[PDB]
Every structure is written in C-alpha cells, then in structure tokens.
Design an enzyme around this catalytic site. Structure first.
Site, short mmCIF file in Angstrom:
data_model
loop_
_atom_site.label_atom_id
_atom_site.label_comp_id
_atom_site.label_asym_id
_atom_site.label_seq_id
_atom_site.Cartn_x
_atom_site.Cartn_y
_atom_site.Cartn_z
N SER A 83 41.21 39.38 40.70
CA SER A 83 41.18 38.40 41.82
C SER A 83 41.97 37.08 41.54
O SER A 83 43.17 37.13 41.26
CB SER A 83 39.72 38.08 42.18
OG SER A 83 39.59 37.70 43.54
N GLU A 117 37.88 46.63 49.27
CA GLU A 117 38.09 45.25 48.88
C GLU A 117 37.42 44.26 49.82
O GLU A 117 37.02 43.18 49.40
CB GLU A 117 39.59 44.95 48.82
CG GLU A 117 40.31 45.64 47.66
CD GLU A 117 40.07 44.90 46.34
OE1 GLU A 117 39.34 43.88 46.36
OE2 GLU A 117 40.63 45.33 45.31
N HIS A 164 34.80 44.81 45.80
CA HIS A 164 35.61 43.92 44.99
C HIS A 164 34.88 43.54 43.69
O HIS A 164 33.72 43.16 43.74
CB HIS A 164 35.95 42.69 45.81
CG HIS A 164 36.76 41.67 45.07
ND1 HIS A 164 38.13 41.75 44.95
CD2 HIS A 164 36.38 40.54 44.42
CE1 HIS A 164 38.57 40.72 44.25
NE2 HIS A 164 37.53 39.98 43.91
#
Ligand SMILES: *[C@@H]1O[C@H](CO[C@@H]2O[C@@H](C)[C@@H](O)[C@@H](O)[C@@H]2O)[C@@H](O[C@@H]2O[C@H](CO)[C@@H](O)[C@H](O)[C@H]2NC(C)=O)[C@H](O)[C@H]1NC(C)=O
Ligand SMILES: *[C@@H]1O[C@H](CO[C@@H]2O[C@@H](C)[C@@H](O)[C@@H](O)[C@@H]2O)[C@@H](O[C@@H]2O[C@H](CO)[C@@H](O)[C@H](O)[C@H]2NC(C)=O)[C@H](O)[C@H]1NC(C)=O
Ligand SMILES: *[C@@H]1O[C@H](CO)[C@@H](O)[C@H](O)[C@H]1NC(C)=O
Lengths: 533, 538
Positions: free
Chosen positions: B201, B330, B443
């Site tokens: 990320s 995601e 995620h």
C-alpha cells in the site's frame, strides 16, 4: 369487363389490375395521384390535394420515382441495385398504391401503410422488395404505400420562409394518410384500423407522425423497423438546415430567401441531386444532406424531448432491428472496407472508421467510443476491430435510438413489442462477414420468398409466413401473438425494466433481455452528459 | 559473559542484539537501532539528521516506539483492525530500524530485503506482528531490514518552499534508513550490492517514489510493490493543496493566534502536543472519503521532480527488475470505513442510491461528469439495482481506482520502458481471516503469508497454508536474489512469465499451482488509465 378493378375515389374513377400470387389473385391500384404535381413554382412547397379528374385514371402500373441520387458503388450488383430507382425519375412523383384481396373485401379490412426508408435522400414505393401482393393475399389486409419527396425536394428548408418551409416530404406522407382516411373504404379498407410500418428513415418517419398531433389522428398503431425519429441522422436544427440550403444554392450558382428559392426553382432537378452530397459538414458513411427539420411546426420540439414528455397510454408499437445494423454502411466510406474482401482492418483504420461512422462528435466523445469498443486484451485484432466498428455504427445510428424509443414509450404507457431479426437469407448477395445487414428483414416481412421465381428455401417460405402473420396480427389487434395459440412460445411486451425481445429466425421464438443494453447505456445515458459539459 | 554473534559494530558505535527462536532454528535480531537523531522539539517537521556516534553498547533488543498516529477504533477489540494498530507506545522519538540476520552470521555477503510498511502515510509501524522478519530470514537466509518513518503531519505536513516544514520528511526517513543499509548492512553479513525494497500500500507507493527519485534510486537494485503504486490518486498531493491542509491544521489548533510567516506558523505548530495534532488531522481533508489520508507526499520539484505519473512515463528503466501485484478484493476492506450501507457485521447489500453515494466517497475529488462515467461503466444495465451486484461493483470501483489500475499502469509502463516485471494476484482467503466472507481476499492479507507468519506455532493456520507461505517466501527471496521469482534450475514447476504491456500476463497466488492469466482488470483499467484523464483536460 372486370368490376373488381373499377373504383371511384373522391377525385374520380380508377382502373386497377389483377395480380397473381402462388396463393391466388390480388387487386392492385398502382400510381394513384394523391397530390398536385409538386413542380415549377410548387417545388419545395407543401403538397396540394390532387384536384378531381374526369374519365378514368389508369392505375395499372407504378408511377415515377421522386428525384434522388442513384447509388453506383457496385454497378450491377444486386445488393445495391435492389434499392435503386426502378422507374424513371420525375418531380411528378406523388402517387400511392393500394393492394387489396380479390375480390375486394365487402367488410372493413385492417390497413397497413408502408413508408419506405433511404435516409430521406432515396427510396420508392415501386421497389420489388416492397411488393404488397403476398401480404395482402396471405393475411387479408389492405396495403397502401406512397411516394414522398426526398433530398432537397422533400427537406430543403429556409426556416421561417414561406417558399421553403421544410418537412414537405413528411407532409407528402401525411397527405397520403389523409387520402387513406377519405378513400380506403372504397377499396374495402377500414379507416379506423390503420397501422403504419416503415424501415430506417421510413421508421423515423413513422415515429415523427407519432410525435406530431395532426398526424396522430390518421392512424392507430405503429411499426418501426431499424429506425427511430431520435436517430442522430434523422433530424436537423433550424440553423444547420439554413446553412445546408444556403450551401446547396451556392454550389448550383444561386445567390433574401425569396430570391434564393426562386433561383433554386430554375435549376433542373438533376442538378440539385448532383450537388446534394457535398453540403454535409463532415465526411460520413451516411449520405444524408436534407432531413426533417425541428422548427416548432411539424415537430414542436426535438423527438427526444417529445418522447420524454409524451403520454403514450393507448399506443401499441412493434419495433426491432436486424442482427448486424452497422455492417452494410461500412463499405460506403469506412477505410479498409469492401464487400469483395474480408475487410480485416487495422487499428488505425478502426480509429478512422469511428470518426466517419459517428460524425460530428468531439474528440473527447470519439475517445470515449474507442474506449468502450476496444477489447483491451486484443486491441489490434483485425476481425474484432471489424466487428467492433460495425457495432459502433449500428449502435449509434440504429440500435440505441430504437432501444431508447422502446424504453421511453413503454415506461410512459405504450405497449411495446421488440424483435431482433437474425436470419441471413440463403439468397443474400453481400459477403458472409456482413451477417444480417440493414434492410434484409424487409423481403421476409413482405413475403417475397413466396415468389416461385426466386430461390428461397421451403424453410424460408414458412419463416416469411410466420413474419407476415406476426405483423398482420399486430395490425389487427395490437398484439403479434397468435391470438389464441396456447402452445406456441409467446412474444412478451418490451419493458424498460425487463427489456425482453424475441429473436426472429428459422427457430421458434426465443425470449432474451436487453437491446445491446451495456452499449446503449453509453450512447443513451453518458454521451449526452459529455456533449453538455 | 557475552555472545559474539549478538554483537556488531556499525559506523555509529556498538550494538547488542538478541537470539530469536524460530520453528526452523535461531535467528539474530537487532531491533530498535537508532538511525536518526530523535525528531523532537525544534526538529519536528524537519528532515532527519543522521544519528550521532555513541560510546558503549546500544541494546538493540526490542522494537522501539511507534511514530505518533491516529489509532483506529471502528471495531474495538476486533483482530482485523487491531492487527494494524500500534503495539508499542506512541512517541515522536521513533526513528529506529530493525535487522534480522541468520544465526550464525552469514560468512559470504547475503541479499538484503528492506521492508516499508503501509498505512496510508498516516499510520503503521515496523513492529507489527505481521511484519516479523524472523520467518523469512530463517527460511530463505536473507538479511531483512525494516524501518520506522514518520507518518501524518509529523512526516508529511508541508509548507512548500519553507525550510521549517519542507514536506516529505517521512520519505527522507526511509531514505536515511536506506543509506544506513548501504553503510552498515555488511556488518551483519548483508550485501549492499543486492538490496531489494518491498512494501505494501503506502509502503509500495513509497518504494515506487524511491524508484523515481534519483538520490534514492542509487541505494537499491530491485523493487516489490504490493497493492500500491506511487501514481495512486491517494498517494501524492500538489504544493498548493498541501499548503492548504497544513494551514488548516495550524488554524484548527490555534496557529497562529491563518497563514502568515511560515517560520512563525511552524514555530507555533511545534509547541502543540503531538496528540493534539493527531486529534485534529482528520479535519483537514477537502472531501469526506474512505481514504482518510490528510498528509501525504507532496510533488514539489525536490524529492519528486514531477508527478509520479509523468516520471513513470518519461523514465528509462533498463536494468531494473520489479515484482508487483494486488489481492483479489482490493476495494472491500475500505468500504466498511464509511461507505453508506456497509458493515463487516452484515452482508452490506446496498441500494442503488447507496451505490451512487459510495462512488463519491470512494472516488473523491472527481467532477460530476467523471462520477457519471464511473456509474455508467460499473452498472450492469440488465440488473441496475441488484444489491449484491452493486456491493461487488462498488468494491471494484474503489479497488480499481485506488490500487489495481495504478499498479497496472506502473507495470505496463515499466515493462515497455525497459524493466523486467513480474505480476501476481493474491487469491487465497486465510482460514484464520476474521473479516466476513463477502469481503473475499481483502487489502493487506497477503502480507502475513509473505512474511511466513503461518509458521508461527502459536497460530492456527492449516498445514497447506504453511506450505503456501513457504512457496511465497521462496518467490520473494528468489526475486531478491536473482531478479526472477522462478526456481533457478527447477523445470517441472509451473513458470512465472514476465508481465509485458501487450500480453499482460500475471499469475494467481493461491493453494493451487501457478495459473497464468492475462490482464490486470484490463477493461476496467482502460477506463481509469486511458479515458478518464482526457475527461479532466476537457
Ligand atoms: C479490401 O478492399 C479495400 C477496398 O479497396 C478496393 O477493393 C478491393 C477488393 C480491391 O479491388 C482494391 O483494388 C480496391 O481499391 C482495400 O482498401 C484499399 O486499400 C488500398 C491500398 O493501397 C487503398 O489504396 C484504398 O484507398 C483502400 N480503399 C478504402 C476504401 O479504404 C483493403 O486494403 C482490402 N483489404 C485487404 C487487401 O486485405
Ligand atoms: C448493515 O450495517 C450498517 C451499519 O450499521 C451498524 O452495523 C449493523 C451491523 C447494525 O449493528 C446496525 O445497528 C449498526 O448501526 C447499516 O447502516 C446503518 O443503518 C442505520 C439505521 O438504518 C443508520 O442509522 C446508520 O447511519 C447506517 N450506517 C451507515 C454507515 O450507512 C445497514 O443498514 C445494515 N444493513 C442491514 C441491517 O440490512
Ligand atoms: C519570518 O520571521 C522570522 C523570525 O524573525 C524572520 O527571520 C523573517 O523576517 C521571516 N521569514 C521570512 C522568510 O520572511
């Protein structure tokens, strides 16, 4: 002497002709004058009702074709020649035709009224493929078709002027519909049951009569085949109409609207025809210079506006498309295309094709088109690009305008039936890659495969008979379904939600959902927002 | 008396570490090594100063403090959120790094993996359990380094042009740690000539920014970007918007008693207790959003000479190898943090009006026309109001816009401009996952497998998951060693082909063998990467 062939209408007496079909005789009255010849000082003017005549008008043969361009892309090829004028050209062309059963019905018979397409620049009621004899014998309807002025003669407009008000080709059609109200009973037709049907610009015309109150009392039901009044090619604004009229004048050596129209009226018809193509603002696969104008009169607003505002309870409408609407048009100017090869185009040709198939939109707009129609896992595959550009052209000009019309009418009270015509004729002269092209359901609707001299299969004849029954059922009752036929699979109405339509082919009806719904959301919902902001 | 393996001298002085037990055997850990002077007091908002040399021995024997940050309280006590929260006390005194090395120390120079954590540039820490480097080091015999770097205002508040709060100091923290690795990792047996960065990320976005900043680019050789990219829309901010945010924060905490002299303004910000800045940072965002990222790297000509998008397009990447990927879902994780209708505790079957509203909060700061385009592309027009489909579509919207399409774009451009690129999609849902089933593979949940966390005996993963964990550690360390994740000299194993702009091949990472597939949401990302920016210009 044969009394069945003698008819008196308000203007006077007519002599018809008996025609043969494999199913038996039919009566035909061809070349009936319904307007004064729109010539000389009457060029560009509204049609005037035909004045009464003495003696007997010969109505045994088709009359002249209204002046129009003759397509020479593939000289002698059946696929293009079948649409070309098959009688001499004349401005004296405002005639209509009536087919009726033999002997003439003695009780009110439902009337079908055919309006031909041809982009508002061409067409004729005398084309073989619009021969009313099979429908009338098989389904016992009365069938009427009219010639109407096309090109500059029908649709040149200097808005506001009395000398060229515009839309007079549509008024030709309306005058023929008034003629049907006043005279069709003399043939056994029922003026209280009149179904309009038309293909392409013919369908757009049907739609325009729907949206114009003085036409709306002249018929009861409507069939729109592969065309819609809200098609991007079907109308023009007042300003753009004036520009095109003015450009035509300049191109033919003419210079005040009165002086301009007077000059245009001194020109031979063929001279206007010769220049009509290069008044268009951008190059296009479409040859559509003079079209209906939105000027507050015939159409008080755009067909889109009129459609959204309309109360359509009480209306039944039959609408549909062929399986490959775009393919036919691509050989008239999309780079890389020909009927004589596979038209496997490159991505550069695809991009070019898009600007020609979707004329007069911004670069941003065109980009959005290329986005939505590219497969980004195969962005350069020639066959997929060919198919995609076909999709682009068909979606934009035919499928999505019809889908939008269908959805709005259904949501606002109309009962709508929708089809996709998916049979490629065994006799088709265009190459295999074109699929089922635009225009090629018409021969089946008119039952042309019953003609023994042609070469359709026995399966194709039964299919034609099915289609003729669907269409005539719709004209009689507002419902194409075999009125009572329990175990036949039913054609459900189209609705904005479920979006059901049927496939028309050699197989029994198959119900499906969505007229290219994903693609038409693009054309009908997003793109308008873009061209705004 | 003393254990020589646990003693190391680095340029600043001497260190003592600790011997860690792992399922596979011992590892040496040096946790909490100071690499900068504490950025305290007058040093708040300033670039890091290198740590001054010390006499005696520093005990590098436990993780140091977490840099000050907002602490997530959405689902209190719930593992799915607490696993990302600070597990040491908060302090501005947080610039420490960690080295894990095999026991005994390697005798020949060993490839170094350097981890950069995510957390939206507002949170995160190298001390999180899930970033425990001991399993990778034991299993693959690499050296593993991770660093803390300042987050939130402390790392990314920017008054561009000023010397007192220039911005990007968090990235400078990361860079200083990378310089430390160059100068010192050989002392632990690591190879300064083979350094692979990896991050997830905001950490992946940081990795990418180091790729695109020439003074960082010299400090490493390969890169791994997990679920993030420097061209992500949440990942950078322009000078003016950064100044606007800085100024509003100042205003909200009473500075000065808006704007004015930058020196005076920052001096007043430096008198506020850290916790007070943290408590107000949520206020400075221009739109309500599910990416609550107030202070992020600033494009200002210095660290980033141009937008990462532009730097990517204009760059020569010959001689680079990169590994990039995403998890399967995601977008889902972000939606429970504010999208109307969403909760981890129900099925989140939203309405169309909730979908429309979700688009605005999941794609903040785009025009109405742009939002219209998003709704168009993501509506199934044969089922425009099916709640389940709308939930899925909104998840795709958020995921595509914020993670998948920026990664796909990074991947395609790097490949086309000279880099060797490998791409994956992580598709395994942990047997231990505490988020509901509709979220799929969310995620952040590949990380525990990459670090080999299932091998921890106190945890309850399946045997197959332990094997899977070992496969991933092998791919990552193969990549670190050779620039290629494929088993050198293993042929009956399914091969991982490079990602290219045309074929766009990637592999699925799950319990099954590698499956090769084409296109990273290619149709969707054509919308985000090719069309939508053209709509910005017009
Ligand atoms: C498919 O044909 C088109 C059309 O070209 C015409 O029709 C062919 C069947 C053949 O008779 C040609 O000689 C004709 O010109 C081809 O597109 C043309 O390509 C040439 C290449 O030099 C170009 O000069 C023309 O302008 C093109 N015409 C149009 C309308 O774009 C196309 O290349 C053919 N496909 C092939 C060969 O794969
Ligand atoms: C699904 O949950 C959301 C979140 O609401 C909370 O979590 C639920 C699991 C349940 O415990 C609720 O009582 C909680 O409030 C629901 O959205 C909320 O709905 C309430 C009342 O309708 C409203 O006051 C909140 O503002 C809503 N919050 C958000 C973020 O929209 C949603 O309605 C639930 N769906 C169901 C129950 O079908
Ligand atoms: C801000 O005030 C400081 C403090 O006295 C002073 O040095 C200067 O005048 C100001 N800075 C700038 C850049 O003008």
């Amino acid at each position: 002497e044969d009394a069945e062939l003698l008819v008196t209408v308000r203007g006077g007496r007519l002599r018809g002709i008996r025609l043969k079909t494999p199913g038996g005789p039919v009566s035909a009255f061809l070349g009936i004058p319904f307007a004064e010849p729109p010539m000389g000082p009457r060029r560009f003017l509204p049609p005037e009702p035909k004045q009464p005549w003495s003696g007997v008008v010969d109505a045994t043969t088709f009359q002249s074709v209204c002046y129009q361009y003759v397509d020479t892309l593939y000289p002698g090829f059946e696929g293009t020649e079948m649409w070309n004028p098959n009688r001499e050209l004349s401005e004296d062309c405002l005639y209509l035709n009536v087919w009726t059963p033999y002997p003439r019905p003695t009780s009110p018979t439902p009337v079908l009224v055919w309006i031909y397409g041809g982009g508002f620049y061409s067409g004729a009621s005398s084309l073989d493929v619009y021969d009313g004899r099979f429908l009338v014998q098989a389904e016992r309807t009365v069938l009427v078709s009219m010639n109407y002025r096309v090109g500059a003669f029908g649709f040149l407009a200097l808005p506001g002027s009395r000398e060229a008000p515009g839309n007079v080709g549509l008024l030709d059609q309306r005058l023929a519909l008034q003629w049907v109200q006043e005279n069709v009973a003399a043939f056994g037709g029922d003026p209280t049951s009149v179904t309009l049907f038309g293909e392409s610009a013919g369908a757009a015309s049907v739609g325009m009569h729907l949206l114009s109150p003085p036409s709306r009392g002249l018929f009861h039901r409507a069939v729109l085949q592969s065309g819609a009044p809200n098609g991007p090619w079907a109308t023009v604004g007042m300003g753009e109409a004036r520009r095109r009229a003015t450009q035509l004048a300049h191109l033919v050596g003419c210079p005040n609207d009165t002086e301009l129209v007077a000059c245009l009226r001194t020109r031979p018809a063929q001279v206007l025809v010769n220049h009509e193509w290069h008044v268009l603002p951008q190059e296009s696969v479409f040859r559509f210079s003079f079209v209906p104008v939105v000027d507050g009169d015939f159409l008080s607003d755009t067909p889109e506006a009129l459609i959204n505002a309309g109360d359509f309870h009480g209306l039944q409408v039959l609408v549909g498309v062929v399986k490959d609407e775009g393919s036919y048009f691509l050989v008239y100017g999309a780079p890389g295309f020909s009927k004589d090869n596979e038209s496997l185009i490159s991505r550069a040709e695809f991009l070019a094709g898009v600007r020609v198939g979707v004329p007069q939109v911004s670069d941003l707009a065109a980009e959005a088109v290329v986005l939505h129609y590219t497969d980004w896992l195969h962005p350069e595959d020639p066959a997929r690009l060919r198919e995609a550009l076909s999709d682009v052209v068909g979606d934009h000009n035919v499928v999505c305008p019809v889908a939008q019309l269908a959805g709005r009418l259904a949501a606002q009270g109309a009962r709508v039936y929708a089809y996709v015509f998916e049979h490629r004729a065994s006799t088709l002269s265009w190459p295999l890659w074109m699929g089922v092209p635009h225009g090629y359901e018409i021969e089946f609707i008119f039952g042309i495969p019953l003609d023994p001299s042609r070469n359709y299969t026995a399966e194709e004849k039964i299919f034609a008979q099915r289609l003729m029954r669907y269409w005539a059922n719709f004209a009689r009752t507002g419902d194409p379904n075999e009125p009572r036929d329990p175990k036949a699979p039913q054609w459900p109405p189209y609705t904005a939600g479920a979006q059901q339509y049927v496939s028309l082919d050699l197989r029994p009806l198959e119900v499906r959902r969505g007229l290219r719904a994903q693609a038409c959301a693009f054309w009908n919902r997003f793109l308008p927002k873009l061209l705004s902001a």
